[PDB]
Amino acid sequence: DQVRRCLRANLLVLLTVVAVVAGVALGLGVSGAGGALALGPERLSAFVFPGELLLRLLRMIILPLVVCSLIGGAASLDPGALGRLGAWALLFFLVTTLLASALGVGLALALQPGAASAAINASVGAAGSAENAPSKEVLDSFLDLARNIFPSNLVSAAFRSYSTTYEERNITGTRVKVPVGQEVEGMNILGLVVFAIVFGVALRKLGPEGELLIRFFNSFNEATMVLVSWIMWYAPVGIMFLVAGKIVEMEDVGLLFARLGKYILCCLLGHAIHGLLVLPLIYFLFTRKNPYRFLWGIVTPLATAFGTSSSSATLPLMMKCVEENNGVAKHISRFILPIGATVNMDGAALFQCVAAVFIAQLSQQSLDFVKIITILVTATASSVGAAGIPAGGVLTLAIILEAVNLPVDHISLILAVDWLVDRSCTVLNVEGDALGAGLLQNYVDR
Amino acid sequence: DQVRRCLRANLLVLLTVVAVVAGVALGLGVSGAGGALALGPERLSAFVFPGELLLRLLRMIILPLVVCSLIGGAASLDPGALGRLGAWALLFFLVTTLLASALGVGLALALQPGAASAAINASVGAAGSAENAPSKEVLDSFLDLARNIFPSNLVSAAFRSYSTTYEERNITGTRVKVPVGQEVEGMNILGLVVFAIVFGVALRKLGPEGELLIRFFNSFNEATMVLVSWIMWYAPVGIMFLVAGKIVEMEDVGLLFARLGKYILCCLLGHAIHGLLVLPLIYFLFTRKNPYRFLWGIVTPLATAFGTSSSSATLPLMMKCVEENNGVAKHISRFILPIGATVNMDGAALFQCVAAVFIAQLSQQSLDFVKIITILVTATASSVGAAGIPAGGVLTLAIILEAVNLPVDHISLILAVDWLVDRSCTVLNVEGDALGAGLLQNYVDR
Amino acid sequence: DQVRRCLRANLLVLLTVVAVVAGVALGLGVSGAGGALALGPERLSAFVFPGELLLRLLRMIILPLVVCSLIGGAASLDPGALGRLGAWALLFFLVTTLLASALGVGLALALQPGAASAAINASVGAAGSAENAPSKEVLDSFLDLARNIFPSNLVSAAFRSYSTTYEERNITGTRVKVPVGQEVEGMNILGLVVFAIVFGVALRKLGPEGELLIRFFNSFNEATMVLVSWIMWYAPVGIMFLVAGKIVEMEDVGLLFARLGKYILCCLLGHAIHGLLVLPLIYFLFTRKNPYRFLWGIVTPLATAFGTSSSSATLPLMMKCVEENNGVAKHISRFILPIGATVNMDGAALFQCVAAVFIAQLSQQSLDFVKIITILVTATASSVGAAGIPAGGVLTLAIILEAVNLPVDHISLILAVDWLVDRSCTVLNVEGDALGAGLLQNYVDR
Ligand SMILES: *[C@@H]1O[C@H](CO)[C@@H](O)[C@H](O)[C@H]1NC(C)=O
Ligand SMILES: *[C@@H]1O[C@H](CO)[C@@H](O)[C@H](O)[C@H]1NC(C)=O
């Protein structure tokens, strides 16, 4: 049969999408028959482990990749030409993030998710529970991101980021708060991207003395790219257990879709127009080429981002598929795509935009025109400061609301539905990188 | 004199064994005349320091060795031949560990250490003291070892391993336990062995691009091997203070040997037959060569393992003595011996076997035939999960006993005698590596 | 104009000294008009940030420099000649530190800072506040420094040093203290200097196998030296905010200079004679060359040490200025100057000498002749154990006083004036390195 020929050449494509629907059929049979209580907590961790093992070993290789592949990328061309590459790049990440957040106002206002329904029953969901939050100030977190760039110690920025807390050591009368930083747990991806680019330029200023050093990091880049190919074969096995592990936790067979299902359909549709109708239209307007043939070549990482629910996870998996399947250049694909891992959270700019209108569609708040331009520019700024940590964008939602002085009286409605909507967020998040990667292929042709 | 000629060529052999008996004569004069109280705690740390300095600097070089020497080892030969090297290897570590644990049942049953003596006075030793223990479940620790393999972050696995604890954040009615992991202190040796082997194969799949990279790690391996030679000369000084520091702590001039000295003679004899009568018989059955001439060439690391009481400590010291003194190959000795550091704790499979019969010889427990095959297969499994941390195998003793549902009413009798029996454990532990290393020299001759 | 020609060639010299006086004029206008309370604590951290950003990114490059530049330095020459370089070196650091501490007795006794003034009103300053201190014993901290050399783990010594605390887990009757170490936060500079020197010698014992490895670390050294040049241009901006941030904290417009201003003039004059009259006289006695033409070539790092107030901070900044401006050799300047970062705290030997006479000039204490030779040799020993941490030498002041059994009834007078006197300490501290660096240039001419 001739149909057997195309299936052998599309083996990873077929196995990935058949597994993401397998766990939904697997997990609903677990959640329906018996439920979460039938397994027991001492066995539930053993069930979710073959999915949780996937997210582990696929994360350990981004450290010898991102600090390594940006060297050989940003030391080939000249630093005068890198400004002709970088300035057109950061302009593109700013427009795509801002245009996605502009859809958030334009879709939530025309649908009004704060409608007369069970969603307005937030008093049963609030309970004063999530009020006990750190909720750092908007001046401090914006100051914290500039301090997270240019890290303190180079080894310490491989596993331990920087943040800030508050204390009250102020027995003087009128007890005030005092900021203090303590370097909490978490990998600093952004702190090492800005190091490797600056370190990559310094090898270009050197003459033939750096020729030994650049071929070292070129070879050490290539050995990791061999090792990411073997994890790619394991990836259809793990995604079957990512979805079928998370679905055991909550239930939406008539409970979660009943209360705030209008909001869920509001934000999934925000991911529907953007990145499936807008980004192909932008890509065709600059290339005049078929975007879906480009999009079909990248479907294993995009389905993996739905499973792993982390943009920083699926970073090496996309770097294999873009340079192999689609016709891009070797060196420039390994530069614009890793810097795009933590700079264009436009899904978060679409998630935190709608969710900040959603609580203001209810509870009778105006937002006529002055708050609209502030809620538009804040979400496209905090998206840069967001990490690739799963469910990390919920923490940056509270700093938008205080700056636009909306009530935070129940943030717990937007919370506890982010096991589903954030998986759609990462797919839209990582898609604009490779669409921007192929957009620079036409730019070098002229 | 002709006797002066052999002593100059056997200088390290003579100085090492004269120092391990020097500290016993030194420490008993300290423990006898004056005792531990005559020195004071502010001076006792200053006394144990020249031994404690030895265990420190000899441990800092295993990180630029194990992740480095396994690269140049497992990138020379073909990956098809590595399966012909690896499968025969892991079969040998399984048999030697299981045969050692089979001696534990066969020697404790024929001697019955739970005899009518002062050893049955465990009520004075129990006191409900060591009941306050974490004692993680057998399903979780077996799950934890698979998660400790394939580490989370590559830099973070150089000093910080992974484990798990328990919390009770369960105010819902019927308060249950919940697992949580927090990455406690401790070097992950096993997490980096599995990384370097996979990374070593990927250089072999590369062509001449990896030729620069393999010669880098070949040279960086050799510079450490120079530096381990200088610490080897310091090693007879330190072992004199390892033994004469630990002996100041407890006393066995008629007190510890009186109560449970039958148990101590039971487990030291278990280390006597295995690895001095069995392993020479296995080595002669496959080589038909003199095992003791091979064994005399490795006596400085084996006496160092008695002093340091850590298998992961004496790993670089054996790698010098095997490739220099005995006639083994250069590349294959630096592969099978580091992977054997944390895979064949057969002394622990002999220690945790007898100690789990010892508490069941007392307190009237049966173990007729069904528990015997479970207590045999559990100890040979948890020996793989054991670390090279001194006195680390005591924590893995409790997970055997709950799985074989024996009482843990006094584990503190097996505790606080492990300053002596565990030093015999590490000597038997590290011996089977080099005997297995020389066993593969005959395998390449055919 | 011909005066425009010299200003273009002295751009860094002119911009650095015009900024250290700019912040004094800036900060006094802030402290005078409005004061510290006019800004608010939520804005004060935003004001001090462009200075605090300078101290951050200029510290992240000392890890890929000190462990890297000492390799290519101490592997070129022979190890027989390194003893002819090292022994003359460590003799020079011992004399310069001891001669500086000899000035501390000779200047405090001839001035008597414990005079009838407001400085003797220490009862208002003591309050029993700083009595709650750890204050580890003199035998333990001297033992701790030898354990901090030869670190435990190589990766862990890049951000996490070693220290010791005390516990009282001693329910046996007569509750005593027990030492325990826990690896507190802080970069171990000294632990990696002793590693790279020993590792550098081992490459020299290797033949042409180390030729690949030495050219690797030679190139990786040079790429950092490019990157330190770009931070040097940012350095006149940051020092303007270092001084104008610290001056907002305290006030000395008639308050701090009134109470103990005799002591401040006593210790600043101790930094005046030493290192501006003594060290030029020593340098002229061995070179017969102009020391101030050598001293004018290094004025950007010396003014930076006044701003950063850390010897370990300004280590790469001096390594650029010495090898470029002044006529020293390339390889030997990158060896003696990094080892001099944490070995010759003679300012601390001048600070901790005077401050230990200052509390004994008051409160009627003798120190006739026997305590004088002990207070001289203790301060030159603890200066080696001092770190490059700002305000780190105050902790090592208490261990001098107990060994010379002077009262520690108010150490808080020497505390809280170290925002000013310690900035003079680091300038004198880092100056003797480069004066010692140029002193070895004449030694290689013969
Ligand atoms: C220990 O056990 C023996 C019996 O074997 C008994 O006679 C004795 O009283 C017990 N206690 C002590 C302190 O010896
Ligand atoms: C300071 O000391 C002087 C004596 O020299 C005394 O007259 C004055 O009252 C003291 N001031 C305070 C505040 O104690």
Ligand SMILES: NC(=O)CC[C@H](N)C(=O)O
């Ligand atoms: N909510 C967010 O967008 C941040 C977390 C999300 N998983 C991401 O990596 O994009």
Ligand SMILES: NC(=O)CC[C@H](N)C(=O)O
């Ligand atoms: N008790 C044990 O056997 C644990 C391992 C042992 N400390 C070793 O290094 O060999």
Ligand SMILES: NC(=O)CC[C@H](N)C(=O)O
């Ligand atoms: N007072 C001191 O000596 C502390 C250390 C000093 N700040 C230095 O960097 O050398």
